[PDB]
Amino acid sequence: PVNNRIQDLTERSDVLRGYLDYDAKKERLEEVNAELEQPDVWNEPERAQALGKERSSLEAVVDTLDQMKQGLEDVSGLLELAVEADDEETFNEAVAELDALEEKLAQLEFRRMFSGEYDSADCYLDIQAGSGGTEAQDWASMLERMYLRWAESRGFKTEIIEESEGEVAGIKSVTIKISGDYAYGWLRTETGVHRLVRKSPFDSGGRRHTSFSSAFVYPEVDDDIDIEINPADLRIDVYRTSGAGAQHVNRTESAVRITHIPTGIVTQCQNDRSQHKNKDQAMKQMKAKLYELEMQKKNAEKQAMEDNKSDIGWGSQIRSYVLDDSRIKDLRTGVETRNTQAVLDGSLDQFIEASLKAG
Amino acid sequence: SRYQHTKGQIKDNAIEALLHDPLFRQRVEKNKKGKGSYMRKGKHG
RNA sequence: CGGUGAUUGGCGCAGCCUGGUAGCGCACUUCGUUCGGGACGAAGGGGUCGGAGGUUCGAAUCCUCUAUCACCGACCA
RNA sequence: CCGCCG
RNA sequence: CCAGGGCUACACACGUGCUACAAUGGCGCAUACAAAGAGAAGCGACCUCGCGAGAGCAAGCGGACCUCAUAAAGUGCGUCGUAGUCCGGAUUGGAGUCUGCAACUCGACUCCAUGAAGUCGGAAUCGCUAGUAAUCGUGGAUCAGAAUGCCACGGUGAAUAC
RNA sequence: CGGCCGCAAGGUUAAAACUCAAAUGAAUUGACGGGGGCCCGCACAAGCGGUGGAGCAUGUGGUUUAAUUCGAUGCAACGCGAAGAACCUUACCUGGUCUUGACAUCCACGGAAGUUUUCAGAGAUGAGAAUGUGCCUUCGGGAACCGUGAGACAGGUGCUGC
RNA sequence: CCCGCAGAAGAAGCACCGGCUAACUCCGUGCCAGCAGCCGCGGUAAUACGGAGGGUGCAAGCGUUAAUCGGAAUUACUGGG
RNA sequence: AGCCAGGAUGUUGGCUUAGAAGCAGCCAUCAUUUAAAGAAAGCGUAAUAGCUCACUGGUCGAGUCGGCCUGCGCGGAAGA
């Protein structure tokens, strides 16, 4: 009857405990309040509010699970002792304690895999085949069918944007937009190199290959809301232009220099006869030069952050897909499945949910 | 430990540059028997 | 700054002056051919004409305004 | 006569 | 292990088939000529009922004898008059029969009504040289039921190979 | 590179770092050739009728699905495994149940096997209420079958046809 | 150097084990970790990786590295094309 | 107007049970004790404390407080 949820709430209550070190969170907490046993923490309020911010996190994480620790026993214990009575008011009161625990569980589910910097926004997959010829390209499209049969099965919407098909079979690249709610939160554990071992129908020898394919998940965000700065932050001078033709080049202050003191770049203009046009041209010229200092601010972050991803070693070989030997092994979390034709064409929640709990 | 990759100063993508790098080249194996299985001396003797 | 002449399918261009009906090649789709891909052949499909408003019964076309691009003139002290 | 590739 | 469901889903694409697009044809009446198989919780005459699928009754036969079982194209006679038409038999509505515990998903068949595309088929492409191709029906296996498939049988019967 | 020679083009002299574990020569057996000669099969040619367009029947890919079980996928997969999916088949799906088990062997205890129906449940199962109590005597027992417990183990249409 | 004293008493490692080249199996791992003088091993039944048992070699040493000649008739007078 | 007094309570007000006890904000903006005392106008606190002011008595002893319509004025007002 209702024992299938009683058995289900127990198994997903201790995986949260094991993948947070439930005994060792109270270990850190008992170190936290030990410093709060000292009275003189109030002399350093930059340190003081840091400790109390860590305290309520360590309190509310274990207090959701410590009330869950009694909660698994007594809600079962309300029904397993009054199955002797078989009372109908007992079924009314059991489900009231139940969905409260199911709310405490699911808000602690969505606590850790929430998580940070527009993680709930919509998404973009960008799958490539890489190297290997046809067989790498036939595997780039099996990943395309795999995620499109997964991400449609959990209530999201697939939108193929850019696509590069193979010469003979498969695809060279695909770039989908997969939109829903908490789309990027389910797909952020997919950025990696998916390794396929099987025997090609496209090879003439029927030999055994080991192909690789990327699947780069990145979330969406708005790019630029960028306008003119406050004019107090820019200094405008005028001067006589350097040139020849008459003393018209050497009588009027028709040049202009707009200097941007939060950066220090000097946009100038001598193009026109009139100062009001030179100032109008040099102002637009500097907003172009404030685009490029904000592009190079973004592009330097794009290089510096992924000189780290390049140097991780082994370039994230995540999830060996060894179809010929009929198994599949995730790498950073180690979850193994014997069903290959189920993980192909959907059913990726053994791999995703077990990797959202781990870091 | 680190990995000295091919593509000097990778800009954008941090995972689709290495996919062309010979760390992720296609490992294809040898048959036996199979179109390309001649021994001449095997592993032993 | 004015003045001149464009914006037509995924792309490159016709038709626009002369108001009623939008094509050409390439690319795409399906089929055929081949062991397979290209090439080749056979079928097709695709736009309401930069945005906005006028004139007329009716606007891709005719006026007017912008929006972008291209060319030209910006001279004498 | 045309007939490229694996 | 069990009950219901699915393998019968359907914007689609391909293969292999059957039915056609008619007049060397359709329909109606009459009438001639086969071979090969199968049959016992099976094949099921005659008779009676039902327009029919079938039912009731009740012989015979584990069979060269009893049943399935009237061969169909053919031929005689009449009509149709070259029209999407008396071609086509799709889809569908109603009423049913049988098997089976059960026929909604999802069976075959009969009756009445419905009357779709199709007027010989682009590039292409397949099979066959003789009782073959083509056409015409018959039987069997699997099987309670459920074939245009498969596997067998005989009817008519070519054209062409320089 | 340097020198010498040349109007020039360039000739002549002539390295090294580095890199590979071979490069090569003649000849043998095959295979291939838009090389040659000879020869055969519906291969072409000469014909006949198809397929490709239409509707349906069936199989497949894709898509859908809770599942649309799995295998076959150039020729040599696609009316193929299937000589027959309403239930069964059936391996799949959703839910309801079971653990020495649906099937096998051994041990210990019970019970002759079975036959008649009720009730609950979708059924599997969960109790009943009834009836029967034999073939060979060690007469702590047989054999046949059923129920129960304990562990060896059964079970697998799970994987690899590389 | 000799005599006497006690007590088997204080005293065995290092390399290798696919072929060359003497000496083989089990387990772990699965083109990974690693080996390597050359050819090459490792892709799930690895005598080649790593460990174990066994064996072979040398032995107060045993291996690696470097250098030299040898094999090399591979600068050949001996002794080549 | 000064000067002396009080300036109460459940009220840790839920709130995000990290805070707002009046003090960043949603409401509500009550009833109580009251002669009065905002379920708070500044200060002060991560939030509670602590210091005042509204409001309330004593004191004193006669005029006082904020707006309207206007007359003349001041600042704003730095050049070779």
Side-chain angles (χ1 to χ4, degrees):
Chain A
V2 297
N3 207 167
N4 283 317
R5 186 180 290 173
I6 295 171
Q7 189 61 256
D8 177 72
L9 287 176
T10 302
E11 61 182 1
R12 282 172 58 193
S13 296
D14 294 331
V15 174
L16 272 69
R17 286 183 176 91
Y19 287 86
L20 288 172
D21 286 330
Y22 171 70
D23 56 354
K25 296 296 283 183
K26 185 170 71 70
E27 176 184 359
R28 181 70 181 92
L29 179 64
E30 190 171 358
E31 283 178 345
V32 167
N33 301 117
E35 188 173 1
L36 292 176
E37 288 178 352
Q38 182 179 3
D40 297 332
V41 65
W42 291 96
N43 298 115
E44 297 177 355
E46 293 182 355
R47 182 173 172 85
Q49 194 174 3
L51 300 179
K53 186 181 288 185
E54 186 176 0
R55 184 185 67 247
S56 180
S57 296
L58 293 177
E59 284 179 351
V61 165
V62 71
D63 288 330
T64 307
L65 290 167
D66 183 71
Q67 297 179 1
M68 189 67 68
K69 181 66 177 176
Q70 188 176 3
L72 292 176
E73 189 182 7
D74 58 358
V75 181
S76 178
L78 288 176
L79 293 173
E80 73 187 1
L81 193 146
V83 67
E84 302 177 357
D86 198 359
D87 189 72
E88 300 179 359
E89 293 179 354
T90 306
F91 182 75
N92 290 317
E93 62 182 358
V95 298
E97 301 183 359
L98 192 70
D99 58 352
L101 291 170
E102 186 173 359
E103 180 178 358
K104 300 288 180 65
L105 184 66
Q107 75 179 358
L108 187 60
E109 289 285 331
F110 289 97
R111 186 181 297 277
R112 183 174 60 250
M113 50 167 285
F114 181 82
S115 180
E117 197 174 359
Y118 292 97
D119 194 77
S120 65
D122 292 333
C123 172
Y124 287 98
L125 269 72
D126 189 73
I127 300 169
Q128 285 189 356
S131 175
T134 301
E135 175 63 30
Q137 292 177 359
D138 184 70
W139 170 244
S141 182
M142 286 193 284
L143 289 172
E144 183 186 3
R145 187 176 66 246
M146 186 182 74
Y147 287 111
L148 202 149
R149 291 289 300 273
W150 178 68
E152 191 170 0
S153 69
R154 293 291 179 268
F156 304 92
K157 289 179 70 69
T158 66
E159 186 175 2
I160 313 294
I161 299 172
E162 294 179 355
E163 195 271 329
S164 177
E165 60 193 1
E167 296 292 329
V168 47
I171 62 170
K172 289 180 68 67
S173 178
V174 72
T175 301
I176 78 169
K177 183 175 181 179
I178 179 63
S179 294
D181 290 332
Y182 289 89
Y184 176 69
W186 289 108
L187 288 170
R188 67 184 179 183
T189 57
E190 306 300 317
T191 68
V193 175
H194 298 86
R195 177 248 190 85
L196 174 70
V197 177
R198 63 178 175 93
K199 301 176 174 66
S200 292
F202 302 100
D203 183 71
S204 179
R207 292 178 291 177
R208 178 176 174 175
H209 294 270
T210 303
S211 300
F212 298 97
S213 180
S214 179
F216 176 64
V217 164
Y218 64 97
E220 66 180 5
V221 79
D222 187 72
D223 294 331
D224 279 331
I225 299 171
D226 186 72
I227 57 170
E228 64 180 1
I229 64 162
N230 300 116
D233 293 330
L234 55 89
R235 186 173 70 87
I236 297 171
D237 288 331
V238 292
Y239 61 99
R240 274 88 59 82
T241 58
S242 180
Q247 285 191 359
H248 183 275
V249 81
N250 208 165
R251 62 174 179 261
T252 56
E253 294 176 352
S254 61
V256 65
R257 281 170 291 153
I258 301 172
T259 302
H260 186 278
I261 61 168
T263 56
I265 44 96
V266 176
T267 300
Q268 66 186 359
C269 185
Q270 297 182 356
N271 207 166
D272 199 76
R273 291 179 174 178
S274 65
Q275 171 179 350
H276 182 269
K277 286 183 181 177
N278 285 320
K279 187 183 287 186
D280 192 77
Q281 291 173 359
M283 189 66 203
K284 186 183 284 187
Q285 186 184 0
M286 189 182 72
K287 187 178 284 187
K289 289 185 178 182
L290 292 176
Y291 289 156
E292 292 186 355
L293 292 175
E294 287 175 350
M295 288 292 174
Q296 291 177 356
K297 188 191 284 186
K298 289 183 180 181
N299 289 320
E301 294 172 354
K302 292 179 181 180
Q303 293 183 358
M305 286 296 294
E306 299 196 5
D307 289 333
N308 288 322
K309 289 183 178 180
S310 66
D311 204 359
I312 61 170
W314 282 96
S316 71
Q317 280 196 353
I318 303 166
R319 287 205 291 268
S320 296
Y321 289 87
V322 282
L323 299 182
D324 54 353
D325 292 333
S326 294
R327 65 183 187 271
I328 171 177
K329 180 73 165 62
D330 196 351
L331 269 71
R332 59 259 184 95
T333 187
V335 57
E336 185 184 1
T337 309
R338 301 299 299 272
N339 292 319
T340 61
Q341 66 182 359
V343 176
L344 301 176
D345 197 70
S347 297
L348 296 169
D349 295 334
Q350 296 175 358
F351 297 96
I352 292 172
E353 297 176 355
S355 178
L356 290 170
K357 68 185 181 182
Chain B
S1 182
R2 296 184 183 275
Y3 175 72
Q4 186 72 257
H5 64 274
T6 297
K7 279 81 178 172
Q9 195 174 1
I10 299 162
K11 329 219 156 143
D12 63 356
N13 242 289
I15 179 113
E16 288 178 350
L18 296 176
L19 189 64
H20 305 285
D21 186 358
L23 202 157
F24 297 108
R25 64 175 177 84
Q26 195 183 14
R27 278 76 168 169
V28 55
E29 77 179 8
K30 184 180 177 180
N31 321 276
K32 45 118 102 44
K33 62 204 146 126
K35 194 178 169 184
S37 301
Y38 185 69
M39 180 176 172
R40 184 181 291 171
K41 62 177 185 176
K43 182 188 173 181
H44 285 304

